[PDB]
């Protein structure tokens, strides 16, 4: 079992002895601090609240375990056993805290309060920041969802430009990051964040997380298609790549099938094997079950353009209404190597210049999509901004002399829509002046209970492109 | 409950129908493929084997669940229900696979076989690569441990050079990555990997994982000390930073205490607050309970150097036997911002140039230590190199025309020590020629059972610096 009492940065175990005496309230907030990523998708807190913070998270056994663990870790007994016993006794192990947040899936400009946390019992003033570690990890789903959405924008722009519509956009970027992430839990969280924007993933763990913590009416929230890997092709022997291809497309003749074709010579595979030897098995396929050729090495853009050139010389090519070339409906390409937000842009731009519709190619991304992202990309930060000591409110904040960018907000915060339709975070409790509309944050957690939640369908709707 | 049948890349579910017919064996291997990081620490496989692959991992319930999930995911019933039921019925849910690996903690040059996987039942030829995804995630602890060890080398070099010994080397790089990683599980795995080289971490989960999956006779495998954060300092109010400091150092007067000092002005804090107003509370501390000043903003090197300059002007400084300046024993510094393998080198080099012993400063790293790393950093790859089809062995491999660096090894592999004391991976079963010593890989998993385990003490011993 997971023990929340051990799920915090070690030093926080000693903070209850560091706050000013007589502090009855500690109020903190999370934001994606201001500076390419002007707006962020707020997604993931609901997962964390439901999996780690709700219900009876404190037990006599967990308190004892934590006590022994930290005693050795610090080689001193500094663990706040009393404080946790109080929560166990008074609230049946339910956390005396209130969390307010903008709706899951919301697209909010940088520099705005996304969620706030405060203790609901004066005795638990120390709890607000104790749970910072667990809650700040929300940076990951937020960042994956945001970076994913930004790639969707790129694809939407070029697809619209070269085809005149956005049909199939939600299937243009597939999640191939399962093996490329740091753990099983991470694979699930990341895949679910990607699914906020797209439907393609090879990590079903993401689908399970979605149905368990969010819920969806969508019959197919996440999908994938049969696909070969280097092992299934190379296993046939180098001289029998053609036999591997033929066997695979024949086995999956009525469904779309992706076939990695760069095991030995991607260009020879496209021109001679697919384009000549087995061409008769491709042109006979249905628009519903195309062959998706998959290069997986070399310069991403150059390889895609050369593959398209080869395929265009071997298969009938049409020109859509926008004047861009389109491969026959039974043949497509997927580039799943070296694809990240930067190269994605380069590839579609190159395709556009060569007059190829973006309809022809879909993409896949792994580590770049779910692993090579940090809390610094969007400056995800959790900071205390208000406390009550001696019954007096105090607006707190940090403002490092050498880095003005790390200045944090002061006092009680609230977010509002402006008259022009934008967002603004009011500080120092100025939201009380009521010069703006209602605070956009809602209480989502209070005293061990999730008080407001969202289906994944609402999350996706909230995260839609404009 | 974790379901291994769902813990693989979606497309692998369709691979049992893609291998050449009459294939009774699929043999694959993991390596940190060649073309910094010339050697890797092999660590983490034991965790994965014990947590996810050992014992009865298949059940009627899990098979049915996977069956339903994949049906919706693929909108077709391609799931190999028959193959899994076979494992359930024949081996009581134990995986018919044999895994051989170099000892945990081993420091191996790039381009060598680190572990191999093969099915032990001809009917399970498809199982070898089914588990690639879960096993390949070993890239993370390997990479963290490797990058962490490379930072230890930098620290050892400069500590040795500026002080003449390696005293306290294992405490020079602290893991502050809990909030900066993608998940709770990742936090624990990463912290464990870091602990292969160092002892400091603020993620006790790493300690638990070590004791549960490796075991240690070490009384204190991982440690931390009391420390303040911006919230506990700023909560006192901007005009009372001194009161915060005074309160914290007195509360922790008998143990080492870290105090973040850049909330408003790191330089004013060091020179006027610590260096004057509260100097009397610092110079009175023991060598076992020093004040550890923590800057946390601005250029990492410039800030450390200016802080040292300031402290040197307010506190007694000695010159060690190597001619480097040393702060008094009751005063130290920790730079836990912007520290990565590259800036770490820059900081210690800058310190050495200014004649400050590395004994004066310790470091902390978060996302750079446990998050901003990818599978391609060491090119961690899993590939099929041998299969038996129609009773005949076939040496398998990939070799992309546009990228020779992606060429994989052929046939049965083994690793041996060379006469010069180096490492060599023999391919095509040449290890059988016996021109080299014994195979360095040992069977660690076979038919559902972990057959060879290493204590964390062995792991640490194996990963020590030369």
Curated annotation (Swiss-Prot), chains A, B:
Catalytic reactions of this protein: beta-nicotinamide D-ribonucleotide + diphosphate = 5-phospho-alpha-D-ribose 1-diphosphate + nicotinamide + H(+)
Entry binding sites for beta-nicotinamide D-ribonucleotide: 202, 294-296, 336-337, 367, 375
A Pfam family: NAMPT_N
Keyword set, alphabetical order: Acetylation, Biological rhythms, Cytokine, Cytoplasm, Glycosyltransferase, Nucleus, Phosphoprotein, Pyridine nucleotide biosynthesis, Secreted, Transferase
Modified residues (Phosphotyrosine): 171
Gene, per the UniProt record: Nampt
Reported tissue expression: Ubiquitously expressed in lymphoid and non-lymphoid tissues.
Pathway assigned to this chain's UniProt record: Cofactor biosynthesis; NAD(+) biosynthesis; nicotinamide D-ribonucleotide from 5-phospho-alpha-D-ribose 1-diphosphate and nicotinamide: step 1/1
Up-regulation conditions: Expression shows a diurnal pattern of oscillation across the 24-hour light-dark cycle in liver, with a reduction in levels before the onset of the dark period (at protein level). Expression shows a diurnal pattern of oscillation in white adipose tissue (WAT), peaking at the beginning of the dark period. Up-regulated during polyclonal immune responses.
Top-tier EC class: transferase
Residues at which diphosphate binds: 179, 230, 294
Record carries keyword Acetylation: yes
Family: Belongs to the NAPRTase family.
Modification Phosphoserine, positions: 455
Enzyme Commission code(s) on record: 2.4.2.12
Protein's GO biological process: circadian regulation of gene expression; circadian rhythm; inflammatory response; NAD biosynthetic process; NAD biosynthetic process via the salvage pathway; NADP biosynthetic process; nicotinamide metabolic process; positive regulation of canonical NF-kappaB signal transduction
Organism from which the protein derives: Mus musculus
UniProt protein name: Nicotinamide phosphoribosyltransferase
Function, as annotated: The secreted form behaves both as a cytokine with immunomodulating properties and an adipokine with anti-diabetic properties, it has no enzymatic activity, partly because of lack of activation by ATP, which has a low level in extracellular space and plasma. Catalyzes the condensation of nicotinamide with 5-phosphoribosyl-1-pyrophosphate to yield nicotinamide mononucleotide, an intermediate in the biosynthesis of NAD. It is the rate limiting component in the mammalian NAD biosynthesis pathway. Plays a role in the modulation of circadian clock function.
SUPFAM superfamilies assigned to the protein according to its UniProt record, in alphabetical order: Nicotinate/Quinolinate PRTase C-terminal domain-like (SSF51690)
GO cellular component annotations of the record: cell junction; cytoplasm; cytosol; extracellular space; mitochondrial matrix; nuclear speck
Subcellular location: Nucleus; Cytoplasm; Secreted
GO MF annotation list: cytokine activity; identical protein binding; nicotinamide phosphoribosyltransferase activity
PANTHER family in the record: NICOTINAMIDE PHOSPHORIBOSYLTRANSFERASE (PTHR43816:SF1)
Subunit and partners: Homodimer.
